[PDB]
Design a protein around this motif. Structure first.
Motif, PDB file in Angstrom:
ATOM      1  N   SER A 113      -0.055   1.511   4.693  1.00  0.00           N
ATOM      2  CA  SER A 113      -0.597   0.953   5.118  1.00  0.00           C
ATOM      3  C   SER A 113      -0.500   1.054   7.025  1.00  0.00           C
TER       4      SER A 113
ATOM      5  N   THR B 220       4.110  -4.928   6.518  1.00  0.00           N
ATOM      6  CA  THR B 220       5.635  -4.757   5.993  1.00  0.00           C
ATOM      7  C   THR B 220       5.018  -3.225   6.687  1.00  0.00           C
ATOM      8  N   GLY B 221       4.059  -2.466   6.213  1.00  0.00           N
ATOM      9  CA  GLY B 221       4.297  -1.212   5.967  1.00  0.00           C
ATOM     10  C   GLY B 221       3.990  -0.561   7.641  1.00  0.00           C
TER      11      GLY B 221
ATOM     12  N   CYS C  24       0.361  -1.297  -0.297  1.00  0.00           N
ATOM     13  CA  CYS C  24      -0.032   0.237  -0.106  1.00  0.00           C
ATOM     14  C   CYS C  24       0.752   1.509   0.675  1.00  0.00           C
TER      15      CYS C  24
ATOM     16  N   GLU D 146      -6.370  -6.060  10.567  1.00  0.00           N
ATOM     17  CA  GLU D 146      -6.653  -4.761  10.818  1.00  0.00           C
ATOM     18  C   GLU D 146      -6.373  -3.580  11.862  1.00  0.00           C
TER      19      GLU D 146
ATOM     20  N   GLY E 113      -2.987  -1.255   8.415  1.00  0.00           N
ATOM     21  CA  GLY E 113      -3.004  -2.780   8.561  1.00  0.00           C
ATOM     22  C   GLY E 113      -3.009  -3.327   7.918  1.00  0.00           C
TER      23      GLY E 113
ATOM     24  N   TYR F 197      -7.797  -0.651  -6.523  1.00  0.00           N
ATOM     25  CA  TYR F 197      -7.114   0.055  -5.317  1.00  0.00           C
ATOM     26  C   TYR F 197      -6.419   1.497  -6.327  1.00  0.00           C
TER      27      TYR F 197
HETATM   28  N1  GDP Z   1      -5.176   3.236  -0.696  1.00  0.00           N
HETATM   29  C1  GDP Z   1      -4.031   1.715  -0.599  1.00  0.00           C
HETATM   30  N2  GDP Z   1      -4.647   1.807   0.253  1.00  0.00           N
HETATM   31  C2  GDP Z   1      -4.287   0.252   0.126  1.00  0.00           C
HETATM   32  C3  GDP Z   1      -3.341  -0.403  -1.190  1.00  0.00           C
HETATM   33  N3  GDP Z   1      -3.742  -2.077  -1.345  1.00  0.00           N
HETATM   34  C4  GDP Z   1      -3.997  -2.102   0.060  1.00  0.00           C
HETATM   35  N4  GDP Z   1      -4.395  -1.210   0.684  1.00  0.00           N
HETATM   36  C5  GDP Z   1      -5.160  -0.858   2.624  1.00  0.00           C
HETATM   37  O1  GDP Z   1      -3.916  -0.678   3.156  1.00  0.00           O
HETATM   38  C6  GDP Z   1      -4.373  -2.306   4.126  1.00  0.00           C
HETATM   39  C7  GDP Z   1      -3.141  -2.976   4.163  1.00  0.00           C
HETATM   40  O2  GDP Z   1      -2.240  -3.110   2.852  1.00  0.00           O
HETATM   41  P1  GDP Z   1      -1.289  -3.728   2.637  1.00  0.00           P
HETATM   42  O3  GDP Z   1      -0.762  -3.656   1.588  1.00  0.00           O
HETATM   43  O4  GDP Z   1      -2.088  -4.728   2.158  1.00  0.00           O
HETATM   44  O5  GDP Z   1      -0.199  -4.081   4.122  1.00  0.00           O
HETATM   45  P2  GDP Z   1       0.816  -4.288   4.057  1.00  0.00           P
HETATM   46  O6  GDP Z   1       1.501  -4.814   2.155  1.00  0.00           O
HETATM   47  O7  GDP Z   1       1.425  -5.793   4.843  1.00  0.00           O
HETATM   48  O8  GDP Z   1       1.247  -3.158   3.813  1.00  0.00           O
HETATM   49  C8  GDP Z   1      -5.565  -2.300   3.697  1.00  0.00           C
HETATM   50  O9  GDP Z   1      -6.468  -2.037   5.054  1.00  0.00           O
HETATM   51  C9  GDP Z   1      -6.373  -1.525   2.236  1.00  0.00           C
HETATM   52  O10 GDP Z   1      -7.538  -0.957   2.559  1.00  0.00           O
HETATM   53  C10 GDP Z   1      -3.116   0.308  -2.599  1.00  0.00           C
HETATM   54  O11 GDP Z   1      -2.400   0.023  -3.171  1.00  0.00           O
HETATM   55  N5  GDP Z   1      -3.696   1.860  -2.539  1.00  0.00           N
END
Ligand code: GDP
Ligand code: GTP
Ligand code: GTP
Ligand code: GDP
Ligand code: K2N
Ligand code: K2N
Ligand code: MG
Lengths: 428, 123, 420, 429, 427
Positions: C137, C142-143, C11, C180, C139, C221
């Motif tokens: 992100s 990794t973020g 995200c 999340e 929830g 997304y």
């Molecule tokens: N707006 C934005 N939010 C995202 C996107 N992908 C996932 N999210 C949100 O961020 C949260 C999870 O982020 P994610 O990237 O899947 O986690 P990470 O990869 O471990 O950081 C969820 O609640 C999603 O609603 C995207 O590319 N853009």
């Protein structure tokens, strides 16, 4: 005899840069410094050709000091006299005084000592600085404490830029002004405040400028300052020397703050109307509009008055004009000091910046009054400060850099007490 | 208001003069503060080197989490490396003597079948 | 004076991607090369977001962290692909889990040091680094996990310099993971003690801005990143453009944050998707246009900043700016005096004649924190999906140790509905 | 990243053989192993197959049984070409429908080899994820080796999660009386070494075919085609790379809230016989006890995590409003403390069916993976038999025979009792 | 996986003969040579009962033991004569006596080791021997005595592998010897501790199935062997044929035996007769089920009424639909629902293999662990104690090398088995 200018802080520096410019025009010095006693009061006849200002310029970012070593005038100073300092003060006094100040102060203080040394009988300093805002409040405060130590009698005149919501950006403002103004006031001698809002006001009414620039405001302050310092540059009787400045204006150690009023601000484009009468301009000095600090002196008492005239004027006129400022308008004098009017004639016709906003005038007036109404703005600041600190509002940023929760208490305290002396000078 | 002036100077490029109107009617800098500036530094160098010892904290607690996990994982592997081959060499011994229990009942219908022919070749 | 950018998580990264190509547009940079544009300003403050390299060339000051290849080769394979310096990519290989602990504790601290390593050598190169910003992100591990770790490890090294994030507060509707709420509460905590400002971006908002406000049925997304990308250019501009502000990033923070916790600007935008001044202004002060899922009506604003954009008369601008502060007068606190300042730069965005962006420190944000802590205790309840962290080596009470941190941050946001 | 399948036991192996077949159709691999897509040297479907050699595409699978017989009919019918002769371990003598035999007596011997031939396949993998263990609940090697494997795989492989597909056993197409013992046995040793475990009730599958396929008395290879389809819709996520459900954690981090409670209930969407349906209608099937995957009734148990796995031609624009009126018509049925679910997984890949099979090519198919508390219905419907037998030592002596303990039986029922309890202990507040 | 066959005793052998030639037909084997038949299955599972030798050839995995030449040269001289490998014949020479002891103690142990020697061969040759089966009489020494010895000596050697017998419980009516009760009780004992399943075949039944159910006046040892020959093919089929079961023999046992004693399947069959009696096609599935569940078609003389089925297997023969079979099967579980036990749940399972026997298009074979077998046991133990009364014929066992107490020591062991099957009208 001699006379050093210190301009700390973005506002300071630009007000500076726009009035060293106007000194330059007035004494006919081409940018490069060469011009084809008297005015040695400000410039120093350094080397064989050039005419360097006796100034030192300090700011804590480069940015602003940087503009100077860029646009012609780049030729006018000495690379030494402009001190820059890498990181900002960030709109905060603590930072200015204690954290970032500490480091540069020792250098500045000494580069000043260079300029005092090429002078035989130095008078004092003119410190230009922003009231609110960071280095402006904090460094200036630290400078003065120190200048107060390194320089004995040697008087200090400050030009403060009392800060204004419309053209500012910073919320934390009030804190910074009330802070400095406390530490600063026992180390200062006479101090001209310049309410940004009032200057912004003149330009909106008197200059027809829609939403005026900084370099719009600065040309205007440039003019006023050059009318106050006029006295010591041409050497024309009255305010010959910094001592006098106080001797006429300040009856009380604390009460420094005189209210300035500049006379015929009129815009080129109007540059050819049958220009104003010795009378009329005198009768403007007493106009809340044309003031220099947003207040109203019709209701506060005057306690020392000066009229600084510049241009083509015989005293014969000045007089009868004053006569009917009395018998028409509001006298308004204190219980115990004559009924003022030290009057200063300077024959030098007032010059304006070339493609500027204002026009060349024949006569201009300047009125330096020490009224008790100028403490209107001492409270109009105070109040914000009060209503913020009541919630510790932004305080933590300060306690952050190193300060004391109580140093804040203790500075409002002083204003409270000043606001009081200024009230305590009315009647009996 | 129509007054009289007191002439206070005339030089090259000017002239001054008072213009009194209606008579008045009678009514320590200190140097020692440079130690103030390194008390300011007294409290910064305290705060910053504490959001350092509060942070050189959240660190080697990370030591735990990170490893008091790993350490709590082999806590299982080498629990169930013998929850096995010690539950299963209880098996090997458990049957192996249910075989012997099988067979020594035979040498007993057998060392019984032998001695009743020594009873036939005697009857 | 100079800023580096950390952009971690699927995200986080896909936001960082869109950000960069939009700002890279404004300045005008070839998918690789250098300037191509009839404008000339651009380059004044390009210094700030781009460390430039040999030949012509301009290369972002960017670090991209993820705990798995997948989404890194999305950027490099997509729009402005090979713009970022090849080894500013910090790979993951491992799991991420959509789990905070993995990212903050195990698989995270596993990397981390290699990230710090790029950041150290970009920021140590950077002639006067003013601060970092980070996108991610909240929830998902990794973020929100690594990043919250990053920022903790980023301070301490750089106390000194100001920290700053666009974080995306996850919603119950439009999300992948059951957990999340857990991941969020854990980083919210982390953030609230280590960042200096934090742009709250709800996906509950982002998605709502598209369906009540845009008639686009199947919101990706993609068109949804698109907003953030825009809003993020919005907020940045005046550290990267004119010379009518000048915006230390610290100054910027000092004048935006009253109380050292609570730096939670819910943002907002002017126009939308792929404009008069009045109609523009009573649009960045509508909630149906806020970036966080709040309603800046239950909650008065602490401080409020807006940057306008377009060669237009700001002689009209404070004439409308005042107007909101009067037609909506009760809803700014009084105890901070001139607490709604604005400024205007005139070089418009990709397309669009007029636009504006809104940062707002509203205590109404309490409404978003409450909302997450609401499906949190409702979960931590019978100690729910908690066992996925149990086992990662976290503590039972360490959850309640951060559920609380938030219930004060709620009730101090509550406590600043005070008196004059 | 990578992903090894273990199939132990006749049932396991045949389920396997009938879904590796279906994987093979889906990714277009001709029996001999070679596929004419440009997608190999050695991404995307590399999750399950390995680009061994310059031509072939071997499954990352190992097959174990304790007779030959079944493993035998792989190295017979084409596909004979598909594996490596290594990956199929056979074992000479049977387990005889008895756990004890599988775990302790006959297991002992072959486990060491299997365990190691697995290790070969994990080594040609850079970042292995987990295992898929396919095996029969009741029945011999199926319960008993699987149990031993897991104990062991649990030791040799750290994090590396384990997903089991159990074939919960059904009186009508069984032969074995002793069944229950074996399932309640393994299911106890097994459950703390497993991560998430799909049960497949033979009866319910037999059920679908008698109702929905018009098959009179359906075969094993009848039932296996059907399970083949379901598994391939569960594993679908990790094979084409799925826009959701894309890794073994965030695949199941979804389903299991509690360490013990693994057992999700699957439901396959449009089973309809060759010789089409609306995005709405198929969703409204997933919640039909008939189309279920374990014989129970979830209208009365509470749901505690819900997934919807879509496959085929679908815009989410549709999925939504269809869900909307699954809530305003039918039985909501949510637990006290977890949102109201519906992680929704869209996979654009149209569902392929076995050529001269029983079912037809569909446009869209749904899959619903719910973790209901009603799936413990089959936890008792098993328990009860076991109870009513052991009560008389019924068949025990066969176990104590091979080498087991009278109390190891006690102690396993003990576990179900306690589990049957946790599953009951998740209702309301 | 592979099975050897021991076939000992005049009664054992003449059964074994008829068995072999019937199964040898199903697979199709020349009185010597190899396959001759248009079917092709056969040979899948021929592996199991036939160890194959050089040339074409197929030779049974068979051992024939007797304690006198007589009946060995009956087979070799009769039907499928020289099919068995010449020295798989273990000759006797001596007496047999129709006496248990001679066969189990003196003249038996005299041989025995030579039998073990063939079996050891065949089984040690046999690539994965799964178990043995045996056939033999129970009233009469060479079968019941030697065999019970064989099996005891068979185990111990082969603990390991599962054991199995068709034993012919002897009746007071239709027998040669006064003493048989004695012989019976002595092996019954032996069996109940050494075999794994034991098909009870009463000659009280066998004979009754011919006069009550055949109108056959003078019932031989021929037409009467005939039944057993058929029923034995019945039970075996699905270890030797399709691929729809798969029938480990051990599996087969585990799922048939609850309690390690009591492995006493009384069996049963579908159709019948051999000579001038037919079937007007009319073997129907219904009329085939309520027929392998009629007592009057049971291979032991019990009556699976008084006494309840523990477990029940049935296998079905004939290219017919099993879509009916389970449906009929169910029916009887409801129609005679009472007399199954509850406590082992799904205790009656059936499967179907579609290739019929010699003659007859459809056919069912029933295996059956009924406690009603107690009926049978109590019948012999019934006439035995009437003889051990004031100890009659016993002096033939007295002086042979047996004890007085020994009769009672196994007369007892039976009395227990009796009231264990009675102690399994349970709860
Ligand atoms: N707006 C934005 N939010 C995202 C996107 N992908 C996932 N999210 C949100 O961020 C949260 C999870 O982020 P994610 O990237 O899947 O986690 P990470 O990869 O471990 O950081 C969820 O609640 C999603 O609603 C995207 O590319 N853009
Ligand atoms: N009159 C005038 N006021 C100014 C000018 N520049 C800034 N100010 C005002 O001064 C206050 C802020 O002071 P600054 O001089 O900007 O702060 P500083 O620390 O001295 O300068 P920095 O180095 O940028 O931090 C506000 O009231 C501004 O309105 C100027 O050029 N002219
Ligand atoms: N769904 C399904 N179940 C099967 C299949 N084959 C056997 N079973 C079931 O498997 C369960 C018993 O497990 P088995 O694999 O048959 O026995 P095992 O000991 O594990 O394997 P073997 O004993 O070696 O044959 C019973 O419930 C049977 O119904 C099949 O093809 N499909
Ligand atoms: N059906 C079957 N039973 C037989 C046959 N011959 C004898 N029997 C019965 O089985 C009993 C024992 O058989 P027998 O051969 O005399 O015992 P042996 O000493 O082993 O030879 C006899 O008493 C008969 O009642 C046979 O031909 N077939
Ligand atoms: C990394 C840089 O972007 C950030 O992360 N943070 C950031 C940016 C700001 C800002 C602020 N507080 N924070 N304040 C602003 C403002 C607007 C009007 C007047 C004064 C300031 C303008 C929007 N820019
Ligand atoms: C040599 C071993 O073969 C025998 O002599 N006896 C033997 C034969 C069996 C059998 C069993 N237990 N014992 N079980 C059966 C069954 C019936 C239905 C379903 C599954 C199996 C069918 C009758 N075949
Ligand atoms: Mg993810």
């Amino acid at each position: 005899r001699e006379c050093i200018s210190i301009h700390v802080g973005q506002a300071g520096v630009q007000i500076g840069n726009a009035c060293w410019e106007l000194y330059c025009l007035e004494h006919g010095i081409q940018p490069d410094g060469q011009m084809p006693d008297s005015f040695n009061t400000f410039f120093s006849e350094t080397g064989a050709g050039k005419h360097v200002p006796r100034a030192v310029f300090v700011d804590l970012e480069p940015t602003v000091i940087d503009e100077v070593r860029t646009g012609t005038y780049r030729q006018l100073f000495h690379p030494e006299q402009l001190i820059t300092g890498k990181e900002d003060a960030a709109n905060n006094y603590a930072r200015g005084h204690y954290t970032i100040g500490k480091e540069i102060i020792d250098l500045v203080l000494d580069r000043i000592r260079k300029l005092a040394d090429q002078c035989t009988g130095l008078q004092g300093f003119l410190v230009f600085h922003s009231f609110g805002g960071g280095t402006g409040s904090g460094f200036t405060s630290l400078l003065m404490e120190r200048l107060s130590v390194d320089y004995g009698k040697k008087s200090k005149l400050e030009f403060s830029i009392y800060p204004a919501p419309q053209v500012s950006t910073a919320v934390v403002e009030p804190y910074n002004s009330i802070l400095t103004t406390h530490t600063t006031l026992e180390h200062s001698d006479c101090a001209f405040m310049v309410d940004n809002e009032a200057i912004y006001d003149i330009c909106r009414r008197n200059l027809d400028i829609e939403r005026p620039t900084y370099t719009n405001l600065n040309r205007l302050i440039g003019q006023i300052v050059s009318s106050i310092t006029a006295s010591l540059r041409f050497d024309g009787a009255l305010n010959v020397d910094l001592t006098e400045f106080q001797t006429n204006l300040v009856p009380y150690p604390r009460i420094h703050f005189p209210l300035a009023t500049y006379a015929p601000v009129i815009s080129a484009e109007k540059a050819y109307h049958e220009q104003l009468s010795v009378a009329e301009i005198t009768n403007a000095c007493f106009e809340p509009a044309n003031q220099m600090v947003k207040c109203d002196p019709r209701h506060g008492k005057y306690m020392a008055c000066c009229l600084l005239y510049r241009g083509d004027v015989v005293p014969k006129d000045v007089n009868a004009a004053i006569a009917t400022i009395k018998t028409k308008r509001t006298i308004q004098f204190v219980d115990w000091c004559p009924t003022g009017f030290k009057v200063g004639i300077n024959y030098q016709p007032p010059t304006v910046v070339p493609g500027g906003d204002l026009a060349k005038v024949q006569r201009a007036v300047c009125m330096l009054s020490n009224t008790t109404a100028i403490a209107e703005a001492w409270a109009r600041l105070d109040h914000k400060f009060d209503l913020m600190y009541a919630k510790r509002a932004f305080v933590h940023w300060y306690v952050g850099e190193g300060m004391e929760e109580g140093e804040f208490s203790e500075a409002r305290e002083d204003m409270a007490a000043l606001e009081k002396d200024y009230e305590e000078v009315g009647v009996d | 208001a129509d007054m009289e002036v007191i002439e206070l100077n005339k030089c090259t490029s000017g002239q001054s003069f008072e213009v009194i109107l209606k008579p008045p009617s009678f009514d320590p800098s200190l140097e020692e503060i440079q130690k103030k500036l390194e008390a300011a530094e007294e409290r910064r160098k305290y705060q910053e080197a504490e959001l350092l010892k509060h942070l050189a904290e959240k660190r080697e607690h990370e030591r735990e989490v990170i490893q008091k996990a790993i350490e709590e994982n082999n806590n299982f592997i080498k629990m169930a490396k013998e929850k096995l081959a010690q539950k299963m060499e209880s098996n090997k011994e458990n049957r192996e003597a249910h075989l012997a229990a099988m067979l020594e009942r035979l040498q007993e219908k057998d060392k019984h079948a032998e001695e009743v022919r020594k009873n036939k070749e005697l009857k | 004076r100079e800023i580096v950018h950390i952009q971690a998580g699927q995200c986080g990264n896909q936001i960082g991607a869109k950000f960069w190509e939009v700002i890279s547009d404004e300045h005008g940079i070839d998918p690789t090369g250098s300037y191509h544009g009839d404008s000339d300003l651009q380059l004044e403050r390009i210094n700030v977001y781009y460390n430039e390299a040999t030949g012509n060339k301009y290369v972002p000051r960017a670090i991209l962290v993820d705990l798995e290849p997948g989404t890194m080769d999305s950027v490099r394979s997509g729009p402005f692909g090979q713009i970022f310096r090849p080894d500013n990519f910090v790979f993951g290989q491992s799991g991420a889990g959509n789990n905070w602990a993995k990212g903050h504790y195990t698989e995270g601290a596993e990397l981390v040091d290699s990230v710090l390593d790029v950041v150290r050598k970009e920021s140590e190169s950077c002639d006067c680094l003013q601060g970092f910003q980070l996108t991610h992100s909240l929830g998902g591990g990794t973020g929100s996990g690594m990043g919250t770790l990053l920022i903790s490890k980023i301070r301490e090294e750089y106390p000194d310099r100001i920290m700053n994030t666009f974080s995306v507060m996850p919603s119950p509707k439009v999300s992948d993971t059951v957990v999340e709420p857990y991941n969020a509460t854990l980083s919210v905590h982390q953030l609230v003690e280590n960042t200096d400002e934090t742009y709250s971006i709800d996906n509950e908002a982002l998605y709502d801005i598209c369906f009540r406000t845009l008639k686009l049925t199947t919101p990706t997304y993609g068109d949804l990143n698109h907003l953030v990308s825009a809003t993020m250019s919005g907020v940045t501009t005046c550290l990267r453009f004119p010379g009518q502000l000048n915006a230390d990033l610290r100054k910027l923070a000092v004048n935006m944050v009253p109380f050292p916790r609570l730096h939670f600007f819910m943002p907002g935008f002017a126009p939308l998707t792929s404009l008069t001044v009045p109609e523009l202004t009573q649009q960045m002060f509508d909630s149906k246009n806020m970036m966080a899922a709040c309603d800046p009506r239950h909650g008065r604003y602490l401080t409020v900043a807006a940057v306008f954009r377009g060669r237009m008369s700001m002689k009209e601008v404070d004439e409308q700016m005042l107007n909101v502060q009067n037609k909506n007068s009760s809803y700014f606190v009084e105890w901070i005096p001139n607490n709604v300042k604005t400024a205007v730069c005139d070089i418009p965005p990709r397309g669009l004649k007029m636009s504006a962006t809104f940062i707002g420190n509203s205590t109404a944000i309490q409404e978003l924190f409450k909302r997450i802590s609401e499906q949190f205790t409702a979960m931590f309840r019978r100690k729910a999906f908690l066992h996925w962290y149990t086992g990662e080596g976290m503590d039972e009470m360490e959850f309640t140790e951060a559920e609380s941190n938030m219930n004060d941050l709620v009730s101090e946001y509550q406590q600043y509905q005070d008196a004059t």
